[PDB]
Design a binder for this molecule. Structure first.
Ligand SMILES: O=P(O)(O)O[C@H]1O[C@H](CO)[C@@H](O)[C@H]1O
Ligand SMILES: [Zn+2]
Length: 455
């Protein structure tokens, strides 16, 4: 197996190129062996609506079975529904066969062993098990398990909408179309579906609500139908995008402001986690409500680990991953988060635009990307962490370098999916935004004067 598919948060391949049926078998063997090493013979297995799903999942299942594992086959489900399985069934282990928000040929594996979502050296450990042949051998089993109807009822019975709402739902031809418009309707909503047919070809737009062009269709539909809200889901349903009645894109860091208020009001002193890509305004808002704001690393697995470590009741990422522990299980779930958004918005007399514009805004840049190399990106960060001068600010190095100034903040960190440096800037003024960009541009040039800085 190529070593590049083994990533910080999970396993990510290109089927035919870097991922084959055989490697999915061996990944299955490795995961069963880790589960058994942690005392867990029971593993749930789910797959998204990708074309290579049926081919690779039988291989994954066979790998696990060949360890002596008792496999619970949940079939085709959103990612969070797999996580739900590994919470409500016998076992605390689970593998999701998905290629997230990526183009059709991509697939991969999100992995939970004995309650813990694997990351960093644990993903690598799986690869090393195969190379070493440190693998269990046994005669496992496979039980068919229809889990979706139970997930559905779990949400419906806990969500209490105060008024009817009309919602455009965009599933981008991903697997959220298996449940999202159905469930949202059951909550007491009228749903206008967009691209809700599961088609692994993605003939319309890539199922990636993180990009604004993938929300064009949703925004027009909201306005055209006088819908109260628009919602978008990514390929596997662990990310949510939010649009207002007037077509305003609500980024997940401002979405997390509304949730934090909500969660913290029933839970004084609750720890609330956000990633380093999120507005500094979250810190203030969380503290304002008597919450404890915990800034952490980008990446779903790192966040979930952080939640168990801190006992946080809620977490959010700038990518669209939102993790509810309160009234839930603590995994990222775009579908459950949507449900929590709708409950809160239905309890208010104002429209979604005005609910969200009540909160403070700063001049914000879009996430910036500089392509470097896989063998340079961490070294650039380390050089910046060793050598860089930022002036007066609060310097955070937990993930790249973030510096919070009184009137804004800048960030630079290495992606864990691509050979890129990821940057973000926020400020009160254009003047201050430029000052911070110039600070960061000069620190990057000082590490490598040939670095292409587009700010
Ligand atoms: O900048 P990187 O590390 O590639 O992060 C991207 O990768 C993750 C996908 O799970 C998302 O959290 C997104 O932020
Ligand atoms: Zn996803």
């Amino acid at each position: 197996l190529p070593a590049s598919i083994f990533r910080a948060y999970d396993i990510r391949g290109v089927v035919g190129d870097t991922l084959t049926a055989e490697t999915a078998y061996w990944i299955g063997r490795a995961i069963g062996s880790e589960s058994l090493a942690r005392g867990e013979p029971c593993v749930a297995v789910g797959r998204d609506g990708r074309l290579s799903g049926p081919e690779l999942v039988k291989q994954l299942i066979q790998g696990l079975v060949d360890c002596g594992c008792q496999v619970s086959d949940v079939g085709m489900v959103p990612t969070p529904v797999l996580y739900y399985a590994a919470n409500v069934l016998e076992g605390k282990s689970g593998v999701m066969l998905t290629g997230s928000h990526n183009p059709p040929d991509y697939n991969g594996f999100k992995i939970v062993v004995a309650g813990e979502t694997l990351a960093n050296e644990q993903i690598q450990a799986l690869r090393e098990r195969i190379e070493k042949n440190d693998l269990a051998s046994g005669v496992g089993s496979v039980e068919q398990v229809d889990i979706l109807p139970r997930y559905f009822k779990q949400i419906r019975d806990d969500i209490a909408m105060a008024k009817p709402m009309k919602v455009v739902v965009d599933c981008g031809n991903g697997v959220a179309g298996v449940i999202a418009p159905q469930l949202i309707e059951a909550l007491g909503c009228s749903v206008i579906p967009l691209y809700c047919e599961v088609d692994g070809n993605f003939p319309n737009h890539h199922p990636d609500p993180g990009k604004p062009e993938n929300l064009k269709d949703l925004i027009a539909k909201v306005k055209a139908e006088n819908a109260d809200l628009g919602l978008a889901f990514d390929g596997d349903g662990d990310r949510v995008g939010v649009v207002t009645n007037t077509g305003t894109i609500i980024y997940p860091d401002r979405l997390l402001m509304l949730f934090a208020k909500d969660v913290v009001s029933r839970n004084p002193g609750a720890d609330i986690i956000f990633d380093v890509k999120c507005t500094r305004r979250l810190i203030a808002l969380i503290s304002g409500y008597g919450g404890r704001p915990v800034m952490w690393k980008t990446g779903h697995s790192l966040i979930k680990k952080k939640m168990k470590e801190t006992g946080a009741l809620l977490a959010g990422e700038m990518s669209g991953h939102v993790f509810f522990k309160e009234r839930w299980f603590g995994f990222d779930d775009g579908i459950y988060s949507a449900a929590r958004l709708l409950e809160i918005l239905s309890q208010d007399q104002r429209d979604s635009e005005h609910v969200f514009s009540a909160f403070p805004s700063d001049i914000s840049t879009p996430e910036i990307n500089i392509t470097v190399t896989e063998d340079s990106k961490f070294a650039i960060i380390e050089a910046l962490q060793r050598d860089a001068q930022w002036g007066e600010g609060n310097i955070t190095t937990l993930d790249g370098v973030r510096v919070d100034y009184p009137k804004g903040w800048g960030l630079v960190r290495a992606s864990n999916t691509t050979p890129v440096l990821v940057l973000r800037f926020e400020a009160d003024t254009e003047e201050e935004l430029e000052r911070i960009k110039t600070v960061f541009r000069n620190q990057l040039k000082a590490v490598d004067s040939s670095l292409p800085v587009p700010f």
